[PDB]
Design an enzyme around this catalytic site. Structure first.
Site, PDB file in Angstrom:
ATOM      1  N   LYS A  12      11.697  -0.142  -5.662  1.00  0.00           N
ATOM      2  CA  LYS A  12      11.390  -1.569  -5.515  1.00  0.00           C
ATOM      3  C   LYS A  12      12.417  -2.468  -6.201  1.00  0.00           C
ATOM      4  CE  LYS A  12       6.321  -1.389  -5.271  1.00  0.00           C
ATOM      5  NZ  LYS A  12       6.325  -1.866  -3.869  1.00  0.00           N
TER       6      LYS A  12
ATOM      7  N   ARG B 198      -0.905   4.915   1.490  1.00  0.00           N
ATOM      8  CA  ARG B 198      -1.485   5.578   2.653  1.00  0.00           C
ATOM      9  C   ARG B 198      -1.392   7.097   2.524  1.00  0.00           C
ATOM     10  NH1 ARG B 198       2.214   2.335   6.832  1.00  0.00           N
ATOM     11  NH2 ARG B 198       2.283   0.988   4.966  1.00  0.00           N
TER      12      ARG B 198
HETATM   13  C1  LIG Z   1       3.032  -5.686  -3.079  1.00  0.00           C
HETATM   14  C2  LIG Z   1       2.191  -4.404  -3.089  1.00  0.00           C
HETATM   15  C3  LIG Z   1       0.828  -4.703  -2.486  1.00  0.00           C
HETATM   16  C4  LIG Z   1       2.899  -3.237  -2.375  1.00  0.00           C
HETATM   17  C5  LIG Z   1       2.129  -1.897  -2.329  1.00  0.00           C
HETATM   18  N1  LIG Z   1       1.895  -1.415  -3.698  1.00  0.00           N
HETATM   19  P1  LIG Z   1       3.165  -0.670  -1.450  1.00  0.00           P
HETATM   20  O1  LIG Z   1       4.565  -0.637  -2.158  1.00  0.00           O
HETATM   21  O2  LIG Z   1       2.471   0.705  -1.646  1.00  0.00           O
HETATM   22  O3  LIG Z   1       3.250  -1.077   0.054  1.00  0.00           O
HETATM   23 ZN   LIG Z   2       4.622   1.326  -2.817  1.00  0.00          ZN
END
Ligand SMILES: CC(C)C[C@H](N)P(=O)(O)O
Ligand SMILES: [Zn+2]
Ligand SMILES: CC(C)C[C@H](N)P(=O)(O)O
Ligand SMILES: [Zn+2]
Ligand SMILES: [Zn+2]
Ligand SMILES: [Zn+2]
Ligand SMILES: [Zn+2]
Ligand SMILES: [Zn+2]
Ligand SMILES: [Zn+2]
EC number: 3.4.11.1
Lengths: 484, 484, 161
Positions: free
Chosen positions: B262, B336
């Site tokens: 991220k 998921r």
């Molecule tokens: C911003 C947040 C809701 C992203 C989810 N944790 P993800 O990276 O699993 O789609």
């Molecule tokens: Zn994630």
């Protein structure tokens, strides 16, 4: 060469073999069972949407394409919110017609498949292709009903599909050809050809100025291309004084973003930023062709959004027709700016309902993609009528919220009454809808954000890759039912 | 010293002056008309959610805060989908209690304002702050009902609010403290405290392996923090064999994205990626406290998503509990992955209903923001029950589409049965929901994407800035009504 | 021969590890001809050979690296100088500390395509019984980020010094 498209259903548990439609079995009987024999020899059964071609079965039809129709009694699917039987037919017939075209056959007769309107829709929508500007083109195919029993239903399908195809043509055409003026002239000719009970006014910049449409004018000034305000009237009611239904559509012929310029990747698709205008105008043309007994008014502000030495600048404050001031923080949130003035003008007709359509936000695409058009409305009665119509057409709609929660984020403004972008990125389609609501006092208003259904790749089986013209048919169906 | 919070409504057309609640008028009489006199002297009338403080009116209440309640008879708002009166009370009481706390008063008595449950919810939710790790903290305020008539309702509100605050605490706590093990232990102590008719299983890695939960294991291996599969039972039905309702929650204690790492900006909020687990586990704790006559099972797979020399790698193929293979194209679509295994396991309980909650997609935030939790379900009956419950609590839900259109985009997979990311970038919340559905065969399943309601700035007046714990009360209300 | 290369490249990296790749090449080469030799060299050999550059890439991951060495002795003259083939065998490339972007990173499972194509060509040459001597060399490992991975600016020493 003459081709024939015939349908076959999926086999039911107690059936010995899958069943042909009435037309399929009639043809099989005519050739003493050779159609069934060859289908059997060819192998595995035909499932929904699949096709197989058989040659030389009859002198009049050298090429016969059999198409899978799925379950015969497939009705309304409560999980998918559509009539499955009709969707199966549109898909199967489109597939069959494409095969006929690949074989370079100029004329084809089509099995009504138990629902002539759905069959015609699959054929006409399926064969469509915008190729006016190409030297190399596929063979032009003339599709017609097989038989003489369902003529009215077949033609109704041709009419509904043709309305959608006009919308697709308008959206697909490059912006240098499809200018505000050209769009207005094309809609004008089609409406007049549809009915003599029509009036069209291509309002010039001078009229827009007199109407004090400052928000719309601010977007238009950056480009050299003259803006126009298209106003169309269809006088179908027996009673001339009957209040009209009013449709409004976003007509940005090309959206570059202006000073708040867009990224280069796929910016060409912005030639379709006039899709809201395309769909609402096309629905009205079709309603006129059908001679529905109702009065309808169509409104479409049209212009380009371009960068230049006189374009809108971030932070600029403009005044809408109703006197409200708007802070233009992002020049690329231009759709809501032109719609503010059009929605205001819509109230002058004392309409029964006000429905607008616009390729309004990328957020709507992130939200629902091409699965359904987002609908924001202050009337559950209106939502239900649109929803019911979509079940019939298969071109689905899905409700989105109109909450003060979103309004609060657009009226929180440093310089003016309302800001053209929310204080956050969250819920982009909802804050955009909240902005529009600040220009609406009518009790039966619905806003359709069609940004996600602007194009088709392979999602809708019966539409080739390109601009989709959705949800034109859903608007036509809504008008037909309303008139009854 | 002690403070007092009293309510006053907006003046009705026929009324000569705005009317106090029963408690407000009683206090005014107790002080020989001084409250009405001083309010009049202070100027403009108090509108919904606003407050004003008066000092020295009575020896026992050196500070009295009067709060605006809005229209007395405000009921269900058909446009906002909530009981407006309750929302007005929650906001007003919260604002009043915050004023008393700013004055550093340790005890406050609260006017029931015609609805003691709503009043208590406003007080308890409004005063909450996670400040365990800070040296400088606000005064701890003890709120109590002013009067004794509505004590049962007041206590009920405290219970509902406490359930949401537990969810908030769990979500807000930093991930280095709130590990999978710690989360399970806190839920355990709270559930056993709530009722003896409960069972808690803090399943270790060895059990997860025996259960063949390969999808969940693939996410957890990248981190050194031990994963756990939390399983809790509440046996409230008179009939031990009565089929249970099963709840499932995404428990990512920290989401860095793994190898598909991220961006840095605001990544700290990912400590709340276990919000799905927090809301369903807290709802179950509250249901147990309420002694609801139903059987419930809660399932929460918990682990961190971190990059390392043994972490999930893009393109890797993993096998879920049901034997279905998944191509992990993006390691950051980990929610998921863990839910696939939990949802499979949920079927072993032969449940009446399966409901899962998860901070699943950023797309959901772009779609609806913090306005409402998105609900995907194959049961309109279930949708309606959740919707009706939300009207009462004010913590809104909004339906999202569960169409094959979206399924087609996740089963188009190069290497496996299903891909963990869709073929296109549009409709991310819808394609994520479609993925989950490939692991569900139950006729009454609902998926709640709570990503957009993970935090609060100031959208919900009665929640200070921070993790929101939404929509815990809606789940508690759903369970209460279901049991009746 | 080409399809074997395709299988090796397409298979996900959690299955197609350095060890697995070497074992598949081994079984195919021995199946092709008895005039062959296979050496699945472990980390200890890589260290003895002073292959510091190769080792620096491999250390970031927990997956064991291997140096695959295969021989096909097809020439009538055993001492005939061989043709040597070398192939890049990165079973998965995440970029390490200088990490890659997420979009389409899954295709990096095929970063061992160089090793796949040269090893498959050798297997096929052996099946054809070509009258030549050939040697195939394939260093195999993953490129992953961790607390012991290569760091930008680090200086490593290759086998030649
Ligand atoms: C911003 C947040 C809701 C992203 C989810 N944790 P993800 O990276 O699993 O789609
Ligand atoms: Zn994630
Ligand atoms: C992608 C597309 C629908 C964006 C709109 N034309 P906007 O730039 O006006 O939001
Ligand atoms: Zn165009
Ligand atoms: Zn724009
Ligand atoms: Zn636009
Ligand atoms: Zn936390
Ligand atoms: Zn996550
Ligand atoms: Zn590979």
């Amino acid at each position: 060469t003459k081709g024939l498209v015939l349908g076959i259903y999926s086999k039911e548990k107690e059936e010995d073999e899958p069943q042909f439609t009435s037309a399929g079995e009639n043809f099989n009987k005519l050739v003493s069972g050779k159609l069934r024999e060859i289908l059997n020899i060819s192998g595995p059964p035909l499932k929904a949407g699949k096709t197989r071609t058989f040659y030389g079965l009859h002198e009049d039809f050298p090429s016969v394409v059999v198409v899978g129709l799925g379950k015969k009694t497939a009705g309304i699917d409560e999980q998918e919110n559509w009539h499955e039987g009709k969707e199966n037919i549109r898909a199967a017939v489109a597939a069959g017609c494409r095969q006929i075209q690949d074989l370079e056959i100029p004329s084809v007769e089509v099995d009504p498949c138990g629902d002539a309107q759905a069959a015609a829709e699959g054929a006409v929508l399926g064969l469509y292709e915008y190729d006016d500007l190409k030297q190399k083109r596929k063979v032009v195919v003339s599709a017609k009903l097989h038989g003489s029993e369902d003529q009215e239903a077949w033609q109704r399908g041709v009419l509904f599909a043709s309305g959608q195809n006009l919308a697709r043509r308008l959206m697909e055409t490059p912006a240098n050809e499809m200018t505000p003026t050209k769009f207005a002239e094309i809609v004008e000719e089609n409406l007049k050809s549809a009915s003599i009970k029509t009036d069209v006014f291509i309002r010039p910049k001078s009229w827009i100025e007199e109407q004090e449409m400052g928000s719309f004018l601010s977007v238009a000034k950056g480009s050299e291309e003259p803006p126009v305000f298209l106003e169309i009237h269809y006088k179908g009611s027996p009673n001339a004084s009957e209040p009209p239904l009013v449709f409004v559509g976003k007509g940005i012929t090309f959206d570059s973003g202006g000073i708040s310029i867009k990224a280069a990747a796929n910016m060409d698709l912005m030639r379709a930023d006039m899709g809201g205008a395309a769909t609402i105008c096309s629905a009205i043309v079709s309603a006129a062709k059908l001679d529905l007994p109702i009065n309808i008014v169509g409104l479409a502000p049209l212009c380009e959004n371009m960068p230049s030495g006189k374009a809108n600048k971030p932070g600029d404050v403009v005044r809408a027709r109703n006197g409200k001031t708007i802070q233009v923080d992002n020049t690329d949130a231009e759709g809501r700016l032109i719609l503010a003035d059009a929605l205001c003008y819509a109230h002058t007709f004392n309409p029964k309902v006000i429905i607008n359509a616009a390729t309004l936000t990328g957020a709507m695409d992130i939200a629902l993609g091409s699965g359904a058009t987002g609908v924001f409305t202050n009337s559950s009665w209106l939502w239900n009528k649109l929803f019911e119509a979509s079940i019939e057409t298969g071109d689905r709609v899905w409700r989105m919220p109109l909450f003060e929660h979103y309004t609060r984020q657009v009226i929180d403004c440093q310089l003016a009454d309302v800001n053209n972008i929310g204080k956050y990125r969250s819920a982009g389609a909802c804050t955009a809808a909240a902005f529009l609501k600040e220009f609406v006092t009518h009790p039966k208003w619905a806003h359709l954000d069609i940004a996600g259904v602007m194009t088709n790749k392979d999602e809708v089986p019966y539409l080739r890759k390109g601009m989709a013209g959705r949800p034109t048919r859903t608007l036509i169906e809504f008008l037909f039912r309303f008139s009854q």
